[PDB]
Symmetry: C3
Subunit: 455 residues, 3 copies
């Protein structure tokens, strides 16, 4: 009544109008397919960080990726989507108008080429990828119940505000003119500096794997590293290629850039390791460099000329390779790989987007930008820096607050203090905890949860 | 001659007309993509049931999934497609009009938005998923040759009639008005009660893993469980999202519902295990609950409001978690996990579809239904029950007949009697059977087939 | 200026025209999705050939697949795409007009339904699949630096000319009328006869695994075989289904043919092994037969009637199964599995395409061909043979030249002579090479590179 297209609410009355008439069907199919591709990045993250670990984590990140898929999907439905995309928000956050996805259907989303329900599906996968990056960064000696509560809180007050600034209709970074093609701020920079907060507050200090003359690479499972890198590179075609919101050839241009950045990242990191080790070929390094290039190109893929995409592989791979060495200077391992690849890599890619963004690349599908230094729009570089500094500041500070507030509450503390922690070898010889005898997550039906040596 | 569009046979003469003009190209692309996604559910099933097993099966279900992909694809081409979709069928079964896919091309299928050749591709994947569920349920001490003959027969006289009732142009459940969005009857309820027939006739009785005080969860391979659950959740976007037959936003609505049902299923099952074990976190339980929610939402995903999708996770996860305990009461393990998740989960989801189905959800793409209790269409619940009872009755009874008839034929008996079965340790010390020395399917080039201790 | 559609160069001025208006959006979405699917075939190849190996390769092919993805993507961007698709080529090779993908954007590609940038993405995946087939065939005792230089050279002077003959605007096989639906010449025949050149020049002679009474199947990892076969069959829907360049139902017809050829290949090979071993069921054989059928149907999938697709499974599976026995006659293992499946299988499929190709199958999307023996176009068979003989001759001869020229240059030699090769057990007891103590690529951070026993 008349139920015709409103652009608001559900978008119109399905008994009176065909809400699909507002959208190009092929735009919708590509973003639906891209959503399925982003979903498999979630176990990709878990396999990557399970395999790279120089310590045997009690919690298996391949399994924890499914936990994170569950918690993130519930959080997004409950209020995460609304806090980012309620079409009635301020410049810093949305509202609860779409609580429990009420009225999320056929109105054109902030990306006008797809309806709200499809943009909800797609952008929910980005929230889930960020959740498993965060669970991966903070997984060492984590308690599972507190970890799930932590992810729910962290998505609500760290991810959703930064996403709003980046993508929301009134978000202040959008208005400023900062460029972030595929969510490098909300996913990579954000999770990387949240990882850093974990590292400096809850990570183990003077860690035996980061202390003295110890190997930079000493992986738990190379096959897990490679399988994770496979799922991540495969899924990144949806992550970057879908960030146009349409079926135009800017989507395929973005995919070419993504593949070439991954390829030149992997080769660059391996070559850097070859110089730095005196002639060894680093299995871990090739995979880390592919990830550095994928992270590097994320803010840029739909904005930069194809030949510059090799720079988004080369330069993040070099800078991140040396960032990992900071684990030695701090003597801290926990959380630091996620910070090195996603935090440093995300900062570097965002910065370089202000150099190489081109108005004629964006205009492949009609997208209008001032451009970067390629267009002599010199001010663009400061817009990038303002966004990166704001994301890093908010993620680091608020994550720190959550971690330290939970640490003060005994049943929410995410990581026990060691003097509180009964060893699994001793739990096993108690009958109530005999299942700790099996310390191999491939056969144990139960998570080897940290237990307070107070019962 | 004139070769114009007939709606029958091949659909028209390709030298005179463009058969593609009848269809929206984006509808076709989504259903083609959805078909590829359903295909990877096939190894998903195999990995899931290989990993969950409390017994070391001689036949590897990850490998047997490829066997099932082969046998199902051949059966579907030979006559399975025709028995379901020959456009000239009765109310209980189709015909042999499309034997060896004769004349399967460009006529609009029973789903009018895609042509016959594409609907054949898509629906053939559902048959294959059901084949590996059945091979998984009956895999313990199976003989491979008899198993392949069994699957061919079972698809023909169990799957294809139930599929016809559910999807065929004249199928009686269609006419009755029963709702089954994505094939929960033909795939899940059907395979689950066929599994039950296996369990009660050919499964081992007084089984040491189900007898006395034994662990409910004792998995063969947690990594296989998790990888299977990954492929299943990823592929389920095609399974449910493609069941609209089109590129409309009802497809994406169905995907949101599927993801939220999986997410709330996984968390619910894990929480139930946490209460029931006194505080342990169940690795197996999280994955089983995701599957219970995916099964639960299958008949409902394109029919129910988004906020009700959490109920299709919560309630199947609870009921299935207690259904698994029935393995203790019966002291039978073999076949029972497939019955618990797909049979019980499929029944519960189908039942709840009669409660929560809504005419305004179906109408997102113009689909016309009376609705469920959400529309005060109280009679809908009895239509659901009639379908579930008919599927369970046919699958249980006819599977029982096939299994017991094959058991009476020495060269077709699917599972040897134990008193007929030479132990692999003794075969190994015979020179003709020395390859039984390697009882690990990761390195053995040969299936460790059960051998009659009569040669 | 006027910047309107030119059909050349970038295709027009993005500030004046919408280059996307030239293309059906759903055609573009399917080819973008198909590109992502071909990408996962790359690790598919690596897992397959890592798992089938009867020798423990020091270089892990699952990891080397990512290396090959990197080197192939760079080579394609640098000049590989231009050497195949520069719209200004001769009848044997392209040019450097699109060096570093200059001007590759919105002009219609040689496949007029997609733009250059998308055809570049798609066809680059075929180059990468061929790169990992070649790295797999030559992986035994390979040195990694020389291998990467070899792949770059081999793509440039073996792959790119054969691809040009097959797909280029003026390619001589195109003009002759040879049929090759999905690149069976450039990918399978080419890599298979390049593998053969490796086998006969650099492979080990009188090899203990191929000499005397030794098992035909003795795999390194059955799970790797199965996972590789999963990724290959899943990805082949993009490989074959995308080779129409469009969203028509010829794409879905091609997928039905691909699935049925894989299915009948797998069953046929397993049955042949069952007869030939006296009743054993071959795990490796089922997977090899699926690959033989996938290779067999590649030149044919969009050209032959559905019922003939079973012949593209049966006949390649039989001929390839006996081709593998040639490893016994030669007493050579290295490289020969890639030749047997891709070289022999590719030749057989190409040959049979001249028998079974049908003008009424091609015309499903308007494609015009004379047809094969199904249309009494008897000359078609000689066109197939001319292409297969030219591909095999060029690939074998030029690969031989590259391998033997690199062998003469000490720092480029791909495989050390054994008398040059220090054993890993002795390297380990040197302090500079102690990391050779860990000969298991699952935990070693470094490739176990062959070292000259001269330092």
């Amino acid at each position: 009544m008349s139920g015709q297209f409103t652009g608001t609410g559900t978008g119109g009355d399905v008994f009176k109008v065909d809400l699909n008439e507002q959208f190009d069907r092929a735009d919708m199919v590509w973003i639906g397919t891209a959503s399925v591709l982003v979903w498999i990045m979630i176990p990709g993250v878990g396999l990557l960080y399970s395999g790279i670990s120089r310590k045997k984590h009690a919690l298996s990140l391949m399994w924890a990726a499914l936990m994170a898929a569950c918690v993130a999907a519930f959080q997004w439905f409950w209020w995460g989507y609304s806090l980012v995309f309620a079409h009635n928000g301020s410049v810093f956050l949305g509202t609860l108008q779409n609580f429990c996805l009420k009225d999320v259907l056929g109105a054109p989303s902030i990306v006008k080429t797809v309806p709200d329900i499809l943009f909800c599906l797609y952008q929910g996968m980005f929230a889930a990828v960020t959740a498993i990056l965060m669970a991966g960064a903070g997984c060492e000696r984590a308690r599972l119940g507190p970890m799930m509560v932590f992810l729910f809180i962290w998505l609500t007050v760290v991810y959703c505000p930064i996403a709003y600034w980046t993508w929301g209709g009134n978000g202040w970074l959008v208005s400023l003119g900062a460029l972030d093609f595929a969510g490098g701020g909300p996913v990579h920079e954000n999770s990387g500096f949240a990882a850093l907060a974990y590292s400096l507050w809850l990570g183990k200090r003077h860690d035996p794997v980061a202390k003295g003359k110890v190997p930079k690479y000493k992986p738990h499972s190379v096959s897990s590293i490679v399988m994770g890198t496979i799922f991540l590179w495969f899924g990144w075609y949806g992550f970057a290629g879908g960030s146009t919101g349409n079926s135009s050839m800017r989507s395929w241009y973005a995919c070419v850039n993504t593949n070439l950045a991954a390829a030149t990242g992997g080769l660059t990191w391996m070559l850097v390791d070859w110089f730095r080790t005196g002639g060894k070929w680093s299995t871990v390094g090739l995979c880390m460099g592919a990830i550095a290039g994928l992270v590097g190109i994320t803010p840029a893929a739909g904005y930069v000329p194809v030949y510059t995409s090799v720079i988004f592989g080369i330069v993040p791979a070099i800078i991140c390779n040396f960032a990992v060495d900071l684990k030695d200077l701090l003597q801290i391992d926990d959380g630091m790989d996620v910070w090195a690849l996603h935090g440093v890599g995300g900062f570097v890619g965002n910065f370089m987007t202000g150099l190489f963004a081109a108005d004629y690349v964006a205009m492949i599908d009609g997208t209008e930008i001032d451009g970067g230094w390629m267009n002599h729009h010199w001010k663009q570089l400061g817009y990038q820096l303002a966004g990166s500094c704001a994301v890093a500041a908010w993620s680091f500070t608020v994550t720190s607050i959550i971690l330290l507030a939970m640490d003060r509450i005994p049943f929410l503390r995410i990581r026990l203090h060691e003097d509180e922690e009964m060893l699994g070898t001793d739990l096993a010889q108690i009958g109530e905890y005999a299942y700790y005898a099996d310390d191999d997550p491939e056969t144990n039906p139960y998570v080897l949860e940290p237990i307070r040596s107070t019962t």
